[PDB]
Coordinates of C-alpha atoms in Angstrom, one line a residue:
Chain S
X140 CA 107.0 121.4 97.2
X141 CA 109.1 118.3 97.8
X142 CA 107.0 115.2 98.4
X143 CA 107.8 111.5 98.5
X144 CA 105.1 109.3 97.0
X145 CA 105.3 105.5 97.7
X146 CA 103.6 102.7 95.9
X147 CA 100.3 101.2 96.9
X148 CA 99.6 98.7 99.7
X149 CA 100.3 95.1 98.8
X150 CA 99.1 91.8 100.3
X151 CA 101.7 89.0 99.7
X152 CA 101.9 85.3 100.8
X153 CA 104.8 83.8 102.7
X154 CA 107.9 83.2 100.6
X155 CA 106.9 85.9 98.1
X156 CA 108.7 89.2 97.4
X157 CA 107.6 92.8 97.4
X158 CA 109.2 95.8 95.7
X159 CA 108.1 99.2 97.1
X160 CA 108.8 102.5 95.4
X161 CA 109.4 106.1 96.7
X162 CA 109.3 108.8 94.0
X163 CA 110.4 112.3 94.9
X164 CA 109.0 115.3 93.0
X165 CA 110.1 118.9 93.6
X166 CA 113.7 118.0 94.3
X167 CA 116.0 118.4 91.2
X168 CA 119.2 117.9 93.2
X169 CA 121.9 115.3 92.3
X170 CA 122.2 114.6 96.1
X171 CA 119.0 112.7 96.9
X172 CA 119.5 109.8 99.3
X173 CA 116.5 107.8 100.5
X174 CA 116.4 105.8 103.8
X175 CA 114.1 102.7 104.1
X176 CA 112.3 102.0 107.5
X177 CA 109.5 99.6 108.5
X178 CA 107.1 99.8 111.4
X179 CA 105.3 96.6 112.6
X180 CA 101.7 97.1 113.7
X181 CA 102.4 97.3 117.4
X182 CA 106.1 97.9 117.3
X183 CA 108.1 101.1 116.7
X184 CA 110.4 101.7 113.7
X185 CA 113.5 100.0 112.5
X186 CA 115.9 100.6 109.7
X187 CA 116.2 98.5 106.5
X188 CA 118.8 100.3 104.4
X189 CA 120.0 103.5 102.6
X190 CA 120.8 104.3 99.0
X191 CA 122.3 107.5 97.4
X192 CA 120.9 108.3 93.9
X193 CA 124.1 109.1 92.0
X194 CA 127.1 107.3 93.4
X195 CA 124.7 104.5 94.0
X196 CA 126.2 103.4 97.3
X197 CA 123.7 101.1 99.1
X198 CA 123.8 99.8 102.7
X199 CA 121.7 97.3 104.6
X200 CA 121.4 96.3 108.3
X201 CA 122.4 93.1 110.1
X202 CA 118.8 91.9 110.3
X203 CA 118.2 91.5 106.5
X204 CA 121.1 89.5 104.9
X205 CA 120.1 88.9 101.2
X206 CA 116.4 89.6 101.4
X207 CA 117.1 93.4 101.3
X208 CA 118.0 94.9 97.9
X209 CA 117.6 98.7 97.3
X210 CA 117.8 100.0 93.7
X211 CA 117.3 103.4 92.1
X212 CA 116.1 105.0 88.8
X213 CA 117.7 108.4 88.4
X214 CA 115.6 109.3 85.3
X215 CA 112.3 108.7 87.0
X216 CA 113.7 109.7 90.4
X217 CA 112.3 106.6 92.0
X218 CA 114.0 104.5 94.6
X219 CA 112.9 100.9 95.1
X220 CA 113.2 98.5 98.1
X221 CA 112.8 94.9 97.5
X222 CA 112.3 92.4 100.3
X223 CA 112.5 88.8 99.4
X224 CA 111.6 85.5 101.1
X225 CA 108.9 87.2 103.1
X226 CA 107.6 85.9 106.4
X227 CA 104.4 86.8 108.3
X228 CA 106.8 88.7 110.6
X229 CA 107.3 91.2 107.8
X230 CA 103.9 92.6 108.1
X231 CA 104.6 96.4 108.5
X232 CA 104.3 99.8 106.9
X233 CA 107.5 100.6 105.0
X234 CA 108.4 104.4 104.9
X235 CA 111.1 106.1 102.8
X236 CA 112.9 109.1 104.4
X237 CA 114.1 112.0 102.3
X238 CA 116.7 114.4 101.0
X239 CA 119.8 112.9 102.6
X240 CA 121.3 112.9 106.1
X241 CA 118.5 114.6 107.9
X242 CA 115.1 112.9 107.4
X243 CA 113.3 116.1 106.4
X244 CA 110.8 114.4 104.1
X245 CA 108.9 111.2 104.6
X246 CA 106.7 109.1 102.3
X247 CA 103.1 108.2 103.1
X248 CA 104.2 104.6 103.9
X249 CA 103.2 101.5 102.0
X250 CA 101.6 98.7 104.0
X251 CA 102.7 95.2 103.2
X252 CA 100.7 92.3 104.7
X253 CA 102.3 88.8 104.6
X254 CA 99.5 86.2 105.4
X255 CA 99.1 82.6 104.2
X256 CA 95.3 82.9 104.1
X257 CA 93.3 83.8 100.9
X258 CA 89.7 84.9 101.6
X259 CA 87.4 84.1 104.6
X260 CA 84.0 85.4 105.7
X261 CA 84.0 86.3 109.4
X262 CA 82.3 84.3 112.1
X263 CA 80.4 86.9 114.1
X264 CA 79.7 86.2 117.8
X265 CA 76.9 88.1 119.7
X266 CA 78.0 89.7 123.0
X267 CA 75.0 90.5 125.3
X268 CA 75.2 92.2 128.8
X269 CA 76.4 90.0 131.7
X270 CA 74.8 89.6 135.2
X271 CA 76.4 92.8 136.3
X272 CA 75.5 95.3 133.6
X273 CA 71.9 102.4 134.2
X274 CA 73.9 101.8 131.0
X275 CA 74.4 98.4 129.4
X276 CA 76.9 97.4 126.7
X277 CA 76.2 95.1 123.6
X278 CA 78.8 93.6 121.2
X279 CA 79.3 91.2 118.2
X280 CA 82.9 90.2 117.7
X281 CA 83.9 89.7 114.1
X282 CA 86.4 86.9 114.3
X283 CA 88.6 85.4 111.5
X284 CA 88.3 87.4 108.3
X285 CA 90.9 88.0 105.5
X286 CA 91.5 90.5 104.0
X287 CA 89.9 93.8 105.2
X288 CA 87.8 95.7 105.3
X289 CA 84.6 94.9 107.3
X290 CA 81.9 97.5 108.0
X291 CA 79.8 97.1 111.1
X292 CA 76.5 99.0 111.8
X293 CA 73.9 98.6 114.5
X294 CA 70.1 98.4 113.7
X295 CA 71.0 98.9 110.0
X296 CA 72.7 102.3 110.8
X297 CA 69.7 103.5 112.7
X298 CA 71.7 103.4 116.0
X299 CA 74.9 105.6 116.0
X300 CA 75.3 107.0 119.5
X301 CA 77.6 104.9 121.7
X302 CA 78.6 102.5 119.0
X303 CA 82.4 102.2 118.8
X304 CA 84.1 99.8 116.4
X305 CA 87.7 99.2 117.3
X306 CA 90.6 98.7 114.9
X307 CA 91.1 95.2 113.4
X308 CA 94.1 93.1 114.5
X309 CA 95.8 90.6 112.3
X310 CA 96.3 87.4 114.2
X311 CA 99.2 84.9 114.1
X312 CA 97.0 82.7 111.8
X313 CA 96.9 85.4 109.3
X314 CA 93.3 86.4 109.9
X315 CA 91.8 89.7 111.0
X316 CA 89.5 89.9 114.1
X317 CA 87.4 92.9 115.0
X318 CA 85.0 94.0 117.8
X319 CA 82.0 96.4 117.7
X320 CA 80.4 97.5 121.0
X321 CA 77.4 99.8 121.6
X322 CA 76.4 101.3 125.0
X323 CA 72.6 101.6 125.4
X324 CA 70.3 102.6 128.2
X325 CA 69.5 99.4 130.1
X326 CA 65.7 100.2 130.4
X327 CA 65.5 99.6 126.6
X328 CA 67.0 96.2 126.8
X329 CA 63.8 94.2 126.9
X330 CA 61.7 96.2 124.4
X331 CA 64.3 97.5 122.0
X332 CA 65.8 94.8 119.8
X333 CA 69.4 95.2 118.5
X334 CA 71.3 93.5 115.6
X335 CA 75.0 93.9 114.6
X336 CA 75.1 94.1 110.8
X337 CA 78.6 92.9 109.6
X338 CA 79.5 93.3 105.9
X339 CA 82.7 91.7 104.4
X340 CA 82.5 92.8 100.8
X341 CA 85.5 90.9 99.7
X342 CA 83.7 87.7 100.5
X343 CA 80.2 89.0 99.5
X344 CA 78.9 87.8 102.9
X345 CA 76.8 90.1 105.1
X346 CA 75.8 88.6 108.5
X347 CA 73.2 90.2 110.8
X348 CA 73.3 88.8 114.3
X349 CA 70.7 89.8 116.8
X350 CA 71.9 90.4 120.4
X351 CA 69.8 89.5 123.3
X352 CA 70.0 87.6 126.6
Chain Y
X63 CA 124.2 99.9 120.3
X64 CA 120.6 100.6 121.4
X65 CA 118.9 103.9 121.8
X66 CA 116.7 104.1 124.9
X67 CA 114.1 106.9 125.1
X68 CA 112.5 108.5 128.1
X69 CA 109.1 107.4 129.5
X70 CA 105.7 108.3 128.3
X71 CA 104.3 111.7 129.2
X72 CA 100.8 113.3 129.6
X73 CA 100.8 117.1 129.6
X74 CA 98.1 119.9 129.5
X75 CA 97.9 122.4 126.7
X76 CA 100.6 125.1 126.9
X77 CA 103.1 123.0 128.8
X78 CA 106.6 121.9 127.9
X79 CA 108.0 118.3 127.6
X80 CA 111.6 117.2 127.4
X81 CA 112.2 113.7 125.9
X82 CA 115.6 112.0 126.1
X83 CA 117.5 109.2 124.1
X84 CA 120.1 107.4 126.3
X85 CA 122.5 105.3 124.3
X86 CA 124.6 102.2 124.8
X87 CA 128.3 107.8 123.6
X88 CA 126.6 109.6 120.7
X89 CA 129.7 111.6 119.7
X90 CA 129.9 111.9 115.9
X91 CA 126.4 110.3 115.5
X92 CA 123.8 112.7 114.1
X93 CA 120.4 112.3 115.9
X94 CA 117.2 113.1 114.2
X95 CA 113.9 113.8 116.0
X96 CA 110.7 112.6 114.4
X97 CA 107.1 112.4 115.7
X98 CA 104.3 110.3 114.6
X99 CA 100.7 111.4 115.3
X100 CA 98.3 108.5 116.0
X101 CA 97.8 106.2 112.9
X102 CA 99.2 109.1 110.9
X103 CA 102.6 109.5 109.0
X104 CA 106.0 110.7 110.3
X105 CA 107.1 114.3 110.7
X106 CA 110.7 115.6 111.4
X107 CA 111.4 118.1 114.2
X108 CA 115.1 118.5 114.0
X109 CA 118.6 117.1 113.8
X110 CA 121.8 117.5 115.8
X111 CA 125.3 116.1 115.0
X112 CA 127.8 115.9 117.8
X113 CA 131.1 116.7 116.1
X114 CA 129.7 119.1 113.4
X115 CA 127.5 120.3 116.3
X116 CA 125.0 121.8 113.8
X117 CA 121.4 121.7 115.1
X118 CA 118.8 122.0 112.4
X119 CA 115.1 122.5 112.9
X120 CA 111.9 122.3 111.0
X121 CA 110.1 125.6 110.3
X122 CA 107.1 124.1 112.0
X123 CA 109.0 123.6 115.2
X124 CA 111.9 126.2 115.0
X125 CA 110.7 128.3 117.9
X126 CA 108.9 125.7 120.1
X127 CA 111.4 122.9 119.8
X128 CA 115.0 122.8 121.1
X129 CA 117.5 119.8 120.8
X130 CA 120.4 119.5 123.2
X131 CA 123.1 116.9 124.0
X132 CA 124.2 116.0 127.6
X133 CA 127.6 117.6 128.7
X134 CA 129.0 114.5 130.4
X135 CA 128.8 110.9 129.0
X136 CA 126.2 111.0 126.2
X137 CA 122.4 111.7 126.1
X138 CA 120.3 113.7 123.5
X139 CA 117.1 115.7 124.4
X140 CA 114.2 117.2 122.6
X141 CA 112.1 119.8 124.5
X142 CA 109.0 121.2 122.9
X143 CA 107.2 124.2 124.4
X144 CA 103.7 125.6 124.2
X145 CA 102.1 122.2 123.8
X146 CA 98.8 121.9 121.8
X147 CA 96.4 119.0 121.4
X148 CA 97.8 118.5 117.9
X149 CA 101.3 117.7 119.3
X150 CA 100.0 114.4 120.6
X151 CA 102.3 111.8 118.9
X152 CA 105.1 109.4 119.6
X153 CA 108.5 111.1 119.5
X154 CA 111.3 108.9 118.0
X155 CA 115.0 109.4 118.1
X156 CA 117.2 108.1 115.2
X157 CA 121.0 107.9 115.4
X158 CA 123.0 107.4 112.2
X159 CA 126.4 106.3 113.7
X160 CA 128.7 104.1 111.6
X161 CA 126.8 102.6 108.6
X162 CA 123.7 101.7 110.7
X163 CA 120.9 104.0 111.7
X164 CA 119.5 102.9 115.1
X165 CA 116.0 103.9 116.3
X166 CA 114.7 104.6 119.8
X167 CA 111.7 102.8 121.0
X168 CA 109.7 106.1 121.0
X169 CA 108.0 108.1 123.7
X170 CA 104.2 108.8 123.8
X171 CA 103.4 112.5 124.7
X172 CA 99.6 113.0 125.2
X173 CA 98.4 116.6 125.3
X174 CA 94.8 117.1 126.5
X175 CA 92.9 119.6 128.5
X176 CA 91.3 116.5 129.9
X177 CA 91.7 115.1 133.4
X178 CA 92.5 111.6 134.5
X179 CA 89.6 109.2 134.7
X180 CA 89.6 105.5 135.6
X181 CA 87.9 103.1 133.3
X182 CA 84.3 102.0 133.7
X183 CA 84.7 98.3 132.8
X184 CA 81.3 92.9 131.3
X185 CA 80.1 91.2 128.1
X186 CA 78.7 87.6 128.1
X187 CA 77.4 85.4 125.2
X188 CA 82.9 77.8 121.4
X189 CA 81.6 81.1 123.0
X190 CA 83.3 84.6 123.1
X191 CA 83.9 86.7 126.3
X192 CA 85.6 90.1 126.8
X193 CA 84.8 93.3 128.8
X194 CA 84.7 96.7 127.0
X195 CA 86.5 99.7 128.7
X196 CA 84.5 103.0 128.7
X197 CA 85.9 106.6 128.6
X198 CA 89.2 106.8 130.5
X199 CA 92.2 109.3 130.4
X200 CA 95.2 108.8 129.8
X201 CA 96.1 106.0 127.4
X202 CA 98.1 103.2 128.8
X203 CA 95.6 100.5 129.8
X204 CA 96.6 96.8 130.3
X205 CA 93.9 94.1 130.1
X206 CA 94.5 90.4 131.1
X207 CA 92.1 87.5 131.8
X208 CA 92.4 85.4 135.0
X209 CA 95.6 87.4 136.0
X210 CA 97.6 86.3 132.9
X211 CA 96.6 82.7 133.1
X212 CA 94.1 82.9 130.2
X213 CA 96.3 83.9 127.2
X214 CA 94.6 81.6 124.6
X215 CA 91.9 83.3 122.4
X216 CA 92.5 86.7 124.0
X217 CA 92.5 89.7 121.7
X218 CA 92.7 93.2 123.1
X219 CA 91.9 95.8 120.3
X220 CA 93.4 99.3 120.0
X221 CA 91.7 102.2 121.9
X222 CA 89.6 104.9 120.3
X223 CA 89.5 108.5 121.4
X224 CA 86.0 110.1 121.6
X225 CA 84.7 113.7 121.1
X226 CA 84.5 113.5 124.9
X227 CA 88.3 113.5 125.0
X228 CA 88.4 110.0 126.6
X229 CA 89.6 106.6 125.3
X230 CA 87.4 103.4 125.3
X231 CA 88.8 99.9 124.8
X232 CA 87.7 96.3 124.0
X233 CA 89.1 92.9 125.2
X234 CA 87.5 89.7 123.9
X235 CA 88.5 86.1 124.6
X236 CA 87.0 83.1 122.8
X237 CA 86.7 80.0 125.0
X238 CA 85.1 76.6 124.7
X239 CA 81.4 76.8 125.5
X240 CA 81.7 73.6 127.5
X241 CA 83.6 75.5 130.3
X242 CA 81.0 78.0 131.0
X243 CA 79.8 77.2 134.5
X244 CA 82.9 75.3 135.5
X245 CA 85.7 77.8 134.4
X246 CA 85.5 81.3 136.0
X247 CA 86.4 84.2 133.7
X248 CA 87.7 87.5 135.3
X249 CA 89.3 90.3 133.2
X250 CA 91.9 92.4 134.9
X251 CA 92.1 95.9 133.6
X252 CA 94.9 98.0 135.0
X253 CA 94.9 101.8 134.5
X254 CA 98.2 102.9 136.2
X255 CA 97.6 106.6 135.4
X256 CA 94.7 106.4 137.9
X257 CA 96.3 103.8 140.3
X258 CA 93.1 101.8 139.6
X259 CA 92.8 98.0 138.7
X260 CA 89.3 96.7 138.1
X261 CA 88.6 93.0 138.1
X262 CA 85.1 92.4 136.6
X263 CA 84.0 88.8 136.6
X264 CA 81.9 87.9 133.6
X265 CA 79.1 85.4 133.2

């Protein structure tokens, strides 16, 4: 089977440079052109460049001027994309397309995160029901944490039904923010006590905030 | 040159959807059709070249998918038949052209047996406010605070589909605690598929 395996995810600081690799196993053809494309977290895709393995002809877009350099190793059948002088605006998943003119095969995508931060424990904020909440909703927002992940449980994992933890968003600052909400019968609110257990293993900090009005 | 794709679609299983890529013509271009499932990787449906005129398809979509080009002017279309839940992804058109490959914005095609529901939207305690959206079909929901006025400290997180078949969403804004009591905070949630806009005031 023909598959394209890209390199692992890398977190880089602004002004740094990242080189991503796409190897292609199962294709022993001398015609093996790879196309580079990046998708920003909310945006759609956009082209970076193209390289053909034997003749070695490379081509970049108007966006990247000299921060885009695609290279290839015929022996190891790996193609590499290097993006230099990174900015925070370069945070995206870089895919490699496959075989040639038609994008028949795709790589799993390598996520590159450009952030100026280093490591932060999150500040969790308890969100209790408002004056208009028979179901009521409870939250803890996990604000300002770098990098991921963060695991959030309610009542030490005792409470699972109705608990939804939404995907993290990297802010402009370079920090992740997250929210965890749980919908619970409102009758329970006075007697049942609820705590949002947030764990950020990268910083070794585990905060348990109790939610109540 | 820019490739402009058709609007987002919501269809029921077994239906057919035809997506289009208008361009700034596409003669001698080579348009590929690719779909991305949510959060997942990319998948190729087919390719059509105008001059060579060879249409190529993926064995996965060779029967259900058909790619065509407009007769007059220039426009490319992808129609996929016998829709399934599993076909829910963003369809992307990519035009090679002359030494640049231009991408379309992408079109979201949602395929669920599920039927349109408006959101059930308040969360109160610098403090942190936001209102959490409950089960709602389909997916485009737009949240703002104070009718676009409050855009500082507002973070609206991506939706999550449930076993229910419905999406739930979260919008949180962090505001100075001094303001509570003087500043009034209303979240405006607009779910256009339902023709519904809820304004829930939070304290």
